[PDB]
Amino acid sequence: FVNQHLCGSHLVEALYLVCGERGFFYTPKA
């Protein structure tokens, strides 16, 4: 489900699903 163009809320949701309890950091401008 991750091998595609993931943009905006779609990307955040993929990070949420993949990282699980580890959490993640989302830095769009960097």
Place this chain on the structure above:
Amino acid sequence: GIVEQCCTSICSLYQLENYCN
């Protein structure tokens, strides 16, 4: 950064996992 690698071009599990804490 992540937009360029996953939004502008096709993402990968390898790249997403680099953003997990």
